[PDB]
Amino acid sequence: MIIPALDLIGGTVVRVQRDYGNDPLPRLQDYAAQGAGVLHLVDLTGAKDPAKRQIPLIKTLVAGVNVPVQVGGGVRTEEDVAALLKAGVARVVIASTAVKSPDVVKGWFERFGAQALVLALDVRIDEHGTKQVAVSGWQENSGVSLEQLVETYLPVGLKHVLCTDISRDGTLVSLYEEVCARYPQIAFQSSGGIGDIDDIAALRGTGVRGVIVGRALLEGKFTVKEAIQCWQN
């Protein structure tokens, strides 16, 4: 699947920052109308301060489409996960906390179930060619490989992993081929490097299950319909 994505700050759709207006619901509705089966939202306001999580907006957006939405941004605690799910979110995207407190997050898998959680990892390919996990693009590596972290959560039934390459020069394959083959029981999602329709074609044979597409849709490079037609060949 193609997974169309929006970043939201204070109700505004933004490109990573260019203002793309305050109409997220009609945009999402049109993504769904074109065949998207899953949508992705990042709450940048909540990422900066969990106390300001955009729950009312998220409720509205989820209510306004007919497809599951995965939502990330400032998911620090069990309470955060629960509040997002209560608001109607299908899956909660766990990022830095999955790196910083694995024993705690393993407990979340036990409580909420693996179908409700997506682990989002930023990866840098280092000098030796190791897939190093980092909590963000502006922080140093955290001293754990993608494989090591995946294998930490497999015993609690990990099913969804979102992988962003934050070391790559330019737009978009070997990385995804490798990890997908190694953990066929996990559905990997790719994020980043989609600049045109050919970048989606590039991922088709890799084993990647989901392709997150954000900026390219906002910039009018191609439509969700075209993306899906390409992805399905």
Phi/psi at 23 (nearest 5 deg)? -115, 55
Measured distance CA(45)–CA(8) in Å, rounded: 7
| Helices 102-112, 78-86: crossing angle, 10 deg rounding | 30
Phi/psi at 92 (nearest 5 deg)? -100, 135
Measured distance CA(225)–CA(2) in Å, rounded: 9
Measured distance CA(83)–CA(55) in Å, rounded: 8
Which of 155, 122, 149, 153 is closest to 138 using CA atoms?
122
Q: What is the resolution of this structure in A?
A: 1.7
Measured distance CA(180)–CA(15) in Å, rounded: 29
> How many domains does the chain fold into?
1
Report the sign of the C-alpha dihedral through residues 124, 102, 189, 41, in that order: negative
Report whether 8 contacts 45 (CB < 8 A). yes
Q: What is the CATH number of the domain that holds 205?
A: 3.20.20.70
Residues paired with residue 66 on neighbouring β-strands, in sequence order: none
Phi/psi at 217 (nearest 5 deg)? -75, -45
**Which positions ≥6 away from 65 have C-beta within 8 Å?**
28, 29, 32, 39
Report whether 145 contacts 120 (CB < 8 A). no
Which of 229, 168, 160, 174 is closest to 194 using CA atoms?
168
Domain holding 48, by residue range, is: 1-233
Q: Report the catalytic residues.
A: 7, 122
Phi/psi at 47 (nearest 5 deg)? -65, -35
Q: Quickly tell me which residue has 């989606």 as its tokens.
A: 200
Residues paired with residue 12 on neighbouring β-strands, in sequence order: 9
Chain breaks in the chain (C to N over 2.5 A) after: 16, 172
* 3-state SS assignment for residue 218: helix
CA angle 195, 199, 203 (to 5 degrees): 145
Measured distance CA(146)–CA(190) in Å, rounded: 14
Phi/psi at 139 (nearest 5 deg)? -115, 155
Measured distance CA(230)–CA(225) in Å, rounded: 9
